[PDB]
Amino acid sequence: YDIQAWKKQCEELLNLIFQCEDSEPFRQPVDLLEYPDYRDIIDTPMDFATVRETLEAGNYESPMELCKDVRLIFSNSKAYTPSKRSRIYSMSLRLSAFFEEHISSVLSDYKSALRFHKR
């Protein structure tokens, strides 16, 4: 029932994501010189360094907010892909499965801890 435990859990999950080769295209903002039309399709760019910096700045109140930003990395990849068989998008799908597998207990434990706090 530790209301604050999600933060270190998210830091460790981000460390695992950075060690994963599938995160390479998503570790820093999409390079607008390499993809000049990126902002014509994507309204809100997001990447794992921005997520880690937001967390470290104390700018996430809950793991649900971090999860919304991580999911935005994957939805941006899906929206920008010219094909469902593209390399970067295919890496996003595996990384998304890995993230969802690991974030599930972080969200469950936090929501349970908050319910206990407000019992």
Ligand X SMILES: Cc1cc(C(=O)Nc2cnn(C)c2)no1
Answer for the pair 80, 41: CB distance below 8 angstroms, yes or no: yes
The b/e string for 94-116 (b: 16+ C-beta within 10 A; e otherwise) is: ebbebbeeebeebbebbeebeee
Interface residue with ligand X, options 21, 34, 37, 40 (CB under 6 A)? 34
Task: Determine, following the binding rule CB under 6 A, whether residue 15 of this chain makes contact with ligand X.
Answer: no
Task: Select from 2, 11, 12, 31 the one that contacts ligand X (CB under 6 A).
Answer: 31
CA distance 24 to 94: 12
Q: Do 32 and 39 form a contact (C-beta atoms < 8 A)?
A: yes
Which residue in 13, 14, 17, 30 binds ligand X (CB under 6 A)? Answer: 30
Residue of the chain from 42, 88, 93, 107 that contacts ligand X (CB under 6 A):
88
Stretch that binds ligand X, among 13-21, 23-31, 97-105, 106-114 (CB under 6 A): 23-31
The sign of the torsion formed by the CA atoms of 55, 59, 64, 68 equals negative
Smallest distance, ligand X to C-beta of residue 60, A: 22
Q: Which residues are near ligand X by CB under 6 A? A: 24-25, 27-28, 30-31, 34-35, 77, 80, 88
